[PDB]
Amino acid sequence: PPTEVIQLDWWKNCVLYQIYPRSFKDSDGDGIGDLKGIISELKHFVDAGVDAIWMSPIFESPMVDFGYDISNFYDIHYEYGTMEDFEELLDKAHELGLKVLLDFVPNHASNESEYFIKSEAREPGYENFFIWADPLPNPENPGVRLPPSNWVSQFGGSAWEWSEKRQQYYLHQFAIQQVDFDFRNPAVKQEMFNIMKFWLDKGADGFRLDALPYLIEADPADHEGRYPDDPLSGLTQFESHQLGYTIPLYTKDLIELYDVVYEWREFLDEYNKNHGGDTRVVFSEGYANVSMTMLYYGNEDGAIGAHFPFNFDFITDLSSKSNARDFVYIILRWLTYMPYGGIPNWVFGNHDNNRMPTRFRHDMVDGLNIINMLLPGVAVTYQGEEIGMRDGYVSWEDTVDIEACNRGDPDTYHLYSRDPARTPYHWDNSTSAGFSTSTNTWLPVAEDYQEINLAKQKETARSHFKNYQALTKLRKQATLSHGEYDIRALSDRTFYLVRSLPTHDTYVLLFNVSERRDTVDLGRVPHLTLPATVYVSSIHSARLAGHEITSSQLSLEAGEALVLKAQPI
Amino acid sequence: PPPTEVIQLDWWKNCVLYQIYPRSFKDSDGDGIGDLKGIISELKHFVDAGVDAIWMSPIFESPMVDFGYDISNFYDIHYEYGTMEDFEELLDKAHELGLKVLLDFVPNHASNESEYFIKSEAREPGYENFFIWADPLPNPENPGVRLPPSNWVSQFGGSAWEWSEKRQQYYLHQFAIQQVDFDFRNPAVKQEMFNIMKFWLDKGADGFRLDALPYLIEADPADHEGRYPDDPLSGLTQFESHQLGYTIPLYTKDLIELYDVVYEWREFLDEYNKNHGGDTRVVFSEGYANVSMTMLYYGNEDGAIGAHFPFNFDFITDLSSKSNARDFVYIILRWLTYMPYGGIPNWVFGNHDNNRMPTRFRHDMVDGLNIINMLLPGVAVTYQGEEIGMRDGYVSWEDTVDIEACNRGDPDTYHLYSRDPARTPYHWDNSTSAGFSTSTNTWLPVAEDYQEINLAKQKETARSHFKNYQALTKLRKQATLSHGEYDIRALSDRTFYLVRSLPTHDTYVLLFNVSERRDTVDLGRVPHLTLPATVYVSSIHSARLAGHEITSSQLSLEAGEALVLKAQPI
């Protein structure tokens, strides 16, 4: 008789799907994805075996950074719909059993926000809402104004913008139009609680928290009443206006940012205690080194932060250049450094990075989806990974990404532009791939949508989507929710991942990540007794689901991945 | 129940290899210089310690500019160390005691006082192209203003190119001006390297530690329009054109051709072992390089076979007193993740080029580090002094002799470059110069702490570093350490485990608190550990003694505290 397992809180082993609403589904023929479109396809998440959806920003926004420049944190961007459409989405998602998280952008507001307009005007209570600074005293040329410091924006050029009206500089770590809040202002910290409480009370199940490494910068009180310069890098390819010119010592990962995150979690815990129902959660976005990433969870003094910080390792440290030993060594980093009791999470893609099968190879999609689903903890899926969408082609003309428009020309833009990972979702082989009834989509529909689309993959005997479905379903098994893991490379080309749990079925990934065939001794795989049955295979595997592995010698093709189901240990 | 037979491994696959620094081991004759008679007189020390194999830093004829890594005759003994007869007696007594003996082979470069160089500089036939000789770079801006062939920078500071007034050409030195780089594209150089190894194997050497292999080969001018191509600049503004770090060594280090020489050396050594029989003769390579470039020393995808192993310097390069237990796990896993299947793992905690293990880490971590070294799968490497927890010796500017410090250093900075602190004489006892010498005039000053830290004190007192070391080398005879699986994970930011297990044989568990703070851990999390278990070894500061019974699954470990537990078979 198999052991009983204690059920986990929903967020500890959810499949979390990141919707990019502008590119998911257009219900209204403007070539722009919208909330009624998402509502019309909430059944997709259930069919997929997704537990939770996180939307990129849907709040009022001048759309300079497609939603990450928010002018009203309390209302819905008209192009996506209304507050009424948002409440309908929560009702219908909840009725289907889905959790819904919103994208909370605490570092900055649009310069078209009431916060900024009032702060620029020095309205009482808003004067010190953002980071405002006098020019650097220039004794040599009192004639030429100097920025407060050399700090560089993520989207190109000075992080300091002159306001004619206020006769001071404001800080922008992102676009000129994205003004940084003063997180040493208690009125700001209170507004962040107000915003989250507002959406929790509407019924959101939590938040994805944007750009947290950038919350807090050096206090000029600590540097004799000036903003201290960031150290220079030396990289001769970067001039004083180019991102990479500085080391962000005074502008990123300040220890004081984590106190804000712990205060958010305290607020959220108290909210959950006072409301009951499903735990509401925060998942943080932070590209940082391992030490500074893990501090999001909490610290050695018992502080508790985000339910988890996102694990970007499959984006930052793995690619088509990676061999099987790289795959193992990077997988092991989160599992080795994550604090005791922390929930691991795996992210293969997002709206800021190239699509999974473009970073890796077309023949690796199933293997990567299996890694996502079979590792312990939380699987994160970016819109399109479930059908193996590829980066779309976007001309300089069709490019709308502020980062490309700031840092690029028609020769260089592709190095900066996030648009190719933002192309409309492939539903079917109809006009604009079933994304819109209109041919004029906000970004161009990738050329391969006739070949790569959801309806094709539901019709055909073997597909990325059917593999995705079999894997989300496997996550219900006690072996994946509660099982141990063992992971090692068998060669430069192939590794195993074994989930095992006494009295429950053993599950094994074998994945040849290389461009060459590989033959391995399955005798080296712990907890694998043969015969074993193929549960899932790569769409071009010689092995079908149900096929029996009896021989201890296994030849994998380039890209080939198998999940084997073997007898319990 | 009954314990499975294991097939016994070839000696080199699980040896304890001890690196002797001859100049600082034992002075037999009162000149304050360690010598071969000194070594012979303490070969019993290796048997006592449980050392299987000794490797000596260089003992060949040398002007001593780089204390023997500058070799003027590859076929004879440095006079201060002794004679060939002393070397033959060392090999004979070491072998009688069952010890294997390796020699430090320095194939990258020869002394500028070598016959090879004097004949090469004079363009003697057969020697003209023994070294990398290059004309000055043509200077079209001002013709005949002398420019070096390239921007290449020496490992010991300044240009890697030295002007010969006699030959009117530059020669290459990746190391000291006195260390002249051989041309590894000259078949006559490659022949000479087999001649040297054949000579010392014929004397009965059990193999070699190969020096500085990443630097063997540099860019061929024939591939760069007949010049030596500049190495790419770094940008790091603390580094000027004459300072190491100013360049990225793209055309001067880790060239793929170097590995072809290594594989030819292995092919010769396999042929020699096959023709002479007796104990396998081995090569262990020294290469500070990235993981990809390091692992190619074992062999390559085409099936070529290289060094028996490249040294694993991860406990020198990537761990220190700044490391937590998660850093310890993640770095230990790097070699085991990246090493090719069939490869023998190895663990180096120190050498004569780095700060001593207790100085890099902390004085209360010595036993924990020696346990790691002995309990990880494969080969344990010990540097002279680590078996008694020797700390770095104080060495003044005035007493500093390391060429790296004399070239790159000044009175205020010498401490940044000098390797001398890790080369101070070995602490035998609390007699004059710690029993290293009967003379108080030692070639480097004896460390101030020898009264506190010496072999004899540690052999007499009930608990010591050396007693722990003995217990750990004895444990390596156990099937579980030779043949067992491993499992390693961090229980906290402070404490990790390493479990060696093998069905029907005892289970051994390291628990190590690498932090400066007490940690409490749940032993229930430790795989293959059933309580009660017996403490087999403890840190000298541990409240637990060998023979102590662990019964509680809750375990408090003090800062630096390590335990090896002996648990029932799985």
Ligand SMILES: C[C@H]1O[C@H](O[C@H]2[C@H](O)[C@@H](O)[C@@H](O[C@H]3[C@H](O)[C@@H](O)[C@H](O)O[C@@H]3CO)O[C@@H]2CO)[C@H](O)[C@@H](O)[C@@H]1N[C@H]1C=C(CO)[C@@H](O)[C@H](O)[C@H]1O
């Ligand atoms: C847009 C995004 O920008 C920042 O993150 C950037 C890194 O700063 C940048 O270095 C780069 O990181 C790559 C790294 O250079 C490379 O060596 C490694 O192999 O891979 C890394 C990842 O590709 O790109 C990342 C993004 O992928 C911030 O840290 C993020 O906060 C930020 N994302 C947020 C913030 C904003 C502003 O509101 C939005 O524009 C964005 O869409 C949102 O998700």
Ligand SMILES: C[C@H]1O[C@H](O[C@H]2[C@H](O)[C@@H](O)[C@@H](O[C@H]3[C@H](O)[C@@H](O)[C@H](O)O[C@@H]3CO)O[C@@H]2CO)[C@H](O)[C@@H](O)[C@@H]1N[C@H]1C=C(CO)[C@@H](O)[C@H](O)[C@H]1O
């Ligand atoms: C002396 C030794 O020099 C070279 O190795 C050096 C590295 O080049 C140097 O960068 C440094 O590496 C450290 C690295 O900087 C640091 O960030 C990392 O954390 O720690 C590294 C190790 O401390 O130090 C190493 C030396 O420890 C060569 O690669 C070696 O081949 C060379 N040793 C050989 C060669 C010679 C010349 O014959 C002898 O002088 C030396 O005694 C011998 O062992």
Ligand SMILES: [Ca+2]
């Ligand atoms: Ca900020």
Ligand SMILES: [Ca+2]
């Ligand atoms: Ca060389």
Ligand SMILES: [Mg+2]
């Ligand atoms: Mg629309």
Ligand SMILES: [Mg+2]
């Ligand atoms: Mg002597």
Ligand SMILES: [Mg+2]
């Ligand atoms: Mg050094």
Ligand SMILES: [Mg+2]
């Ligand atoms: Mg196991």
